[PDB]
Design a protein around this ligand. Structure first.
Ligand SMILES: CC(=O)N[C@@H]1[C@@H](O)[C@H](O[C@@H]2O[C@H](CO)[C@@H](O[C@@H]3O[C@H](CO)[C@@H](O)[C@H](O)[C@H]3NC(C)=O)[C@H](O)[C@H]2NC(C)=O)[C@@H](CO)O[C@H]1O
Ligand SMILES: CC(=O)N[C@@H]1[C@@H](O)[C@H](O[C@@H]2O[C@H](CO)[C@@H](O)[C@H](O)[C@H]2NC(C)=O)[C@@H](CO)O[C@H]1O
Ligand SMILES: *[C@@H]1O[C@H](CO)[C@@H](O)[C@H](O)[C@H]1NC(C)=O
Ligand SMILES: *[C@@H]1O[C@H](CO)[C@@H](O)[C@H](O)[C@H]1NC(C)=O
Length: 383
């Protein structure tokens, strides 16, 4: 009764060559809940914004995805609104008044009926975040939105789920999330236990450390997966509502000129923006898991792979390039820890970045780990 929650990116179909990943590539039986990402909100009318209508509607992307339930009827197929690229300011605007929230709620209900989704995942990053167009009143008003969506979903009578993707840093929780009240209204809390470190921080480090390292200080002291989940519990969220995110990607850095120290915490060339783009994701500062294993794990690789003994994550480097990520060893450790803590399950950002082609070895190696552990695990009663 554990969840394996799989975010599916609708833009992965445009990746070239073996990176192309579409609806037909989703390994549906490895997940219990699959989430089509993303739709957005309009700036002016607070309605659902379809972000790639040629794919999502004209080529039947939404419906191809939800009709997967014909062959896989025990799986839930929902849609996520928001995501990083959507920004936060349209959401802070939409929740500012009862009337604009109600316009959005009606639009959501029509959309979910039209494309036969099982519910909605809220991915506003983030209520209350001044750097993302937010402000103080978002914390109350985001809770109101959640309460109003839940009531609308109850009225529709189809048993739709409502979930949310959330951060784990204390300051973000204080600015945006009434934890006990949100955890009561939501079916699952998808914790984004990743991007905890990255180029923006100004030093090289793994981005999903499980436990504190000696160099973690001040704001970073508790910014690790174990302490972040413990924070959600301490703030009032039941253990059996918390789903732990696992990144299928690494955060990369370009090290400072002449820097031969590759240890965690080493200085970087921050203006570079991160490591150089890899060929399929083509984004400075991150690599898909399959982009990492095809470079790091080959027989003649010139990459050097190391292990963070405290954070329990791999990192690898070559030249000026350094990347921290998750591999089968680190994912196995986190699966065992999820079971030890009694959490509701595991989530991945995102299923289209697993080695789904088997370029390095077993196809879908990381999601198979999530599925192996979660499917044999019984979630205990709240602690
Ligand atoms: C649940 C959750 O993890 N949510 C967040 C994710 O949004 C975020 O991943 C990033 O998502 C954005 C989209 O919101 C990606 O930007 C996209 O970039 C490509 C080209 O580089 C572009 O073609 C797309 O148009 C654009 N998206 C859209 C909506 O069209 C970004 O690359 C993702 N970053 C990754 C995968 O590392 C994840 C991980 O950061 O965490 C939350 O912030
Ligand atoms: C903490 C900080 O300096 N904030 C900015 C970051 O939000 C941002 O990247 C993002 O890191 C967040 C953690 O703070 C993640 O939650 C978020 O998923 C991630 N963004 C994505 C999806 O790529 C960086 C810019 O990339 O700027 C920082 O200043
Ligand atoms: C939906 O499935 C149809 C029939 O297989 C296919 O032609 C189309 O490309 C699919 N669209 C998407 C977005 O996957
Ligand atoms: C890679 O991304 C950059 C930055 O957006 C873009 O300008 C360039 O066209 C992209 N290249 C490919 C092959 O998509």
């Amino acid at each position: 009764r554990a969840r394996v929650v799989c975010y599916f990116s609708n833009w992965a179909v445009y990746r070239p060559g073996v990176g192309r990943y579409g609806i037909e590539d989703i390994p549906v039986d490895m997940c219990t809940h699959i989430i089509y990402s993303f739709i957005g909100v309009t700036e002016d009318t607070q309605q659902v914004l379809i972000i790639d209508p040629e794919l999502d509607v004209d080529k039947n992307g939404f419906k191809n995805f939800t009709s997967l339930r014909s062959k896989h009827p025990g799986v839930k197929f929902t849609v996520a609104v928001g995501g990083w690229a959507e920004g936060g300011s349209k959401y802070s605007k939409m929740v500012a008044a009862k009337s604009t929230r109600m316009a959005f709620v009606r639009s959501v209900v029509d959309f979910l009926n039209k494309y036969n989704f099982d519910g909605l995942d809220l991915d506003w990053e983030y209520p209350g975040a001044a750097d993302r167009g937010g402000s103080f009143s978002d914390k109350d008003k985001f809770l109101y939105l959640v309460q109003e969506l839940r009531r609308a979903f109850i009225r529709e009578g189809k048993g739709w789920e409502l979930t949310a993707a959330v951060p784990l840093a204390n300051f973000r929780l204080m600015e945006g999330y009434h934890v006990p009240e949100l955890c009561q209204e939501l079916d699952a809390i998808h914790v984004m236990s990743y991007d905890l470190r990255g180029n923006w921080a100004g030093f090289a480090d793994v981005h999903s450390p499980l436990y504190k390292r000696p160099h973690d200080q001040w704001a970073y002291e508790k910014l690790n997966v174990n302490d972040g989940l413990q924070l959600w519990e301490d703030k009032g969220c039941p253990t059996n509502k918390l789903v732990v995110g696992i990144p299928f990607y690494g955060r990369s850095f370009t090290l400072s000129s002449g820097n031969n120290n590759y240890n965690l915490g080493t200085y970087i060339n921050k203006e570079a923006g991160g490591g150089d783009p890899a060929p399929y994701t083509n984004a400075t500062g991150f690599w898909a898991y399959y982009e990492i294993c095809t470079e790091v794990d080959t027989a003649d690789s010139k990459w050097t792979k190391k292990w963070d003994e405290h954070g329990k994550c791999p990192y690898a480097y070559k030249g000026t390039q350094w990347v921290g990520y998750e591999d089968p060893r680190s994912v196995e450790i986190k699966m065992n820890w999820i079971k030890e803590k009694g959490y509701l399950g595991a989530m991945t950002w995102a299923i289209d970045m697993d080695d789904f082609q088997g370029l390095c070895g077993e196809k879908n190696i990381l999601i198979k780990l999530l599925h192996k552990h979660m499917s044999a695990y019984t979630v205990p009663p709240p602690r």
